[PDB]
């Protein structure tokens, strides 16, 4: 995809994350588990909802009665009507079909971007307190219990607190 | 070392969509925007019943072809439903002058 | 034949009681109808590419 995340540096999605579109998987002493990110899932569901509703809303619908009212000596008008009728069907069929094809590409790129942005959100929080494994995961240079993982997931991770413990583990890896 | 991973949703959906650059792409959720279903009957249109002529043409009903049973005298309708080839048009052969325009007048 | 219903949109084959923007049923409609297309399937993606 355009943003390189979905089916890219994150290979495959998660059957085990039932409660949202994008989220986290943690792994520490206490145990592993999945958690949906609700801010970014709700935003995305807002956008896609709005997209769908606009594609339907913005259509202008008028009353029209369409029949075959011309007789056997009015074939020239009947053909004018056919050209008109057929012409609008060609227009609406092409627009609908391309509209769907084109907004289907944008919706999938939207999700790609949403996932890449979330990865970047955690990246920017953790800085060098974690190694970047490159498959969408961060290996922590410190001990990160459940309340720490929650702080990453809700955007309140305290870099300073763990900063020292982390650099002693990085210094240590330089052996 | 403890880990946190970013990832995205997956499920048991077999709903497929197309894009400009790909076809038969399976997705987690989709939305139909094409109506394909009809109830298979003739209904009122905005609260007003249609005038259904079973085996009669408009000309038969108006002039009172004796095979065109005197209608319940429905005082108002929204559209007219004629069969494709009504059996009871003019019983005595002939023509109806400006018929198509009168029919369009009597449409509603 | 008549079937004691009500629509905004009426087709020779039957009534369309719906608020979608396109339909593929019959062109010779009477009412506030969806736009008629020669299409079997118009489906918008809302979720993401599914795994595997």
């Amino acid at each position: 995809g355009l943003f390189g995340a979905i089916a890219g540096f994150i290979e495959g999605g998660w059957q085990g994350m039932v409660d949202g579109w994008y989220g986290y998987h943690h792994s520490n002493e206490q145990g592993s588990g999945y958690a949906a990110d609700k801010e970014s899932t709700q935003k995305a569901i807002d956008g896609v909802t709005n997209k769908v509703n606009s594609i339907i809303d913005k259509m202008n619908t008028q009353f029209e009665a369409v029949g075959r009212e011309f007789n056997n000596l009015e074939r020239r008008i009947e053909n004018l009507n056919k050209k008109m009728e057929d012409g609008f069907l060609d227009v609406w069929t092409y627009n609908a079909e391309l509209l769907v094809l084109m907004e289907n590409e944008r919706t999938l790129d939207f999700h790609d971007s949403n996932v890449k942005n979330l990865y970047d959100k955690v990246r920017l929080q953790l800085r060098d307190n974690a190694k970047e494994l490159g498959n969408g995961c961060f290996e922590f240079y410190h001990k990160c219990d459940n309340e720490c993982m929650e702080s990453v997931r809700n955007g309140t991770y305290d870099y300073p607190q763990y900063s020292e413990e982390a650099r002693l583990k990085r210094e240590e890896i330089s052996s | 070392g403890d880990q946190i991973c970013i990832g995205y949703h997956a499920n048991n959906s077999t709903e497929q969509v197309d894009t400009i650059m790909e076809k038969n792409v399976t997705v987690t959720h989709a939305q139909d925007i094409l109506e394909k279903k009809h109830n298979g009957k003739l209904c009122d249109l905005d609260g007003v019943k249609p005038l259904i002529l079973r085996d009669c043409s408009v000309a038969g009903w108006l002039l009172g072809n004796p095979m065109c049973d005197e209608f319940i005298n429905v005082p108002e309708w929204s559209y007219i439903v004629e069969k494709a080839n009504p059996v009871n048009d003019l019983c005595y052969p002939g023509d109806f002058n400006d018929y198509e325009e009168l029919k369009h007048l009597l449409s509603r | 034949e008549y079937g004691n219903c009500n629509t905004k949109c009426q087709t020779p084959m039957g009534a369309i009681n719906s608020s979608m923007p396109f339909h593929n049923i019959h062109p010779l409609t009477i009412g506030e109808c969806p736009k008629y297309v020669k299409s079997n399937r118009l489906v918008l993606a809302t979720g993401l590419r599914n795994s595997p």
């Epitope: 409660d19 899932t41 709700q42 569901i45 339907i56 809303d57 | 959720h29 939305q31 | 608020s19």
Partner: antibody, heavy 130, light 113 residues
Framework: QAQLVQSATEVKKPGASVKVSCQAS????????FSWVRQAPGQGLEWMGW????????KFAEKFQDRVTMSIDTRTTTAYMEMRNLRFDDTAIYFC???????????????????????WGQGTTVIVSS | DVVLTQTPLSSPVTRGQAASISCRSS???????????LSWIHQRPGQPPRLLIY???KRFSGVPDRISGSGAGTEFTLTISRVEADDVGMYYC?????????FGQGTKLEIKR
């Protein structure tokens, strides 16, 4: 806490008009829609119409289509309902009920901002009597 | 329009026993997203309604597991499985998968003594 507080009671004369307000607080106003529902003395609940706080888009009941108007003020997170040409039948309690922000909903997860009729105002009594 | 036929109108129930309210819709209530937005609300005398069940069978926050929703298609059922005084009031089935919105006639619960 998330809440809906409607306006005080209204005593009106026949022919007059009334404008009941409903103030949202504690939640994102533009994430929701609002149905107006009334309860006449001894009668069951009756839907009057709906308005999106995201869109301003309305939907109406047959019976009130003409003499009711809904509106929205996103700066005071307040929904309104105006009734023209008051009758005696209109003596009732008027509730403002929280609902969906759009007529097509993608309720793909259960905790999403949505769920229709999940939050109600305390009600506004309009009395119509000369 | 969707018609919701609620039955019975009146439901005397002895304290501790179960009550079962029925709601039939004229028509399928499946929204364009797969969800069926058939809900039950409850109104105590002198108070606003409060949501009990959404999506046929899901308990709103705060609602005891003795309150229970079921159904599919066009027949839906609220049961209240050991009734107390606080359960008295009006019960309405409601649908929000479609416009106009619809409510049932109402069911008045009452303690049978």
């Amino acid at each position: 806490q998330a809440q809906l507080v409607q306006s005080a009671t209204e005593v009106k004369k026949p022919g007059a008009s009334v404008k009941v307000s409903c103030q949202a607080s504690g939640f994102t106003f533009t994430s929701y829609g609002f149905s107006w529902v009334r309860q006449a003395p001894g009668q069951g609940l009756e839907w009057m119409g709906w308005i999106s706080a995201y869109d301003a888009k309305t939907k109406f009941a047959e019976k009130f289509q003409d003499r009711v108007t809904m509106s929205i003020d996103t700066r005071t997170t307040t929904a309104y309902m105006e009734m023209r040409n008051l009758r005696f039948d209109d003596t009732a309690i008027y509730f403002c009920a929280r609902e969906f922000r759009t007529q097509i909903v993608l309720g793909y997860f259960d905790w999403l901002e949505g769920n229709a009729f999940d939050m109600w105002g305390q009600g506004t009594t309009v009395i119509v009597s000369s | 329009d969707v018609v919701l036929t609620q039955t019975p109108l009146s439901s005397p129930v002895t304290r501790g026993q179960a009550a079962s309210i029925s709601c039939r819709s004229s028509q399928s209530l499946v929204h364009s997203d797969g969800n069926t937005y058939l809900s039950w609300i409850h109104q105590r005398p002198g108070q606003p309604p409060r949501l009990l069940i959404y999506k046929i069978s899901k308990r709103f926050s705060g609602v005891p597991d003795r309150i229970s929703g079921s159904g599919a298609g066009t027949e839906f059922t609220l049961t209240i499985s050991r009734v107390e005084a606080d359960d008295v009031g009006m019960y309405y089935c409601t649908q929000a998968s479609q416009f106009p919105r619809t409510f049932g006639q109402g069911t008045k619960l009452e303690i049978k003594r």
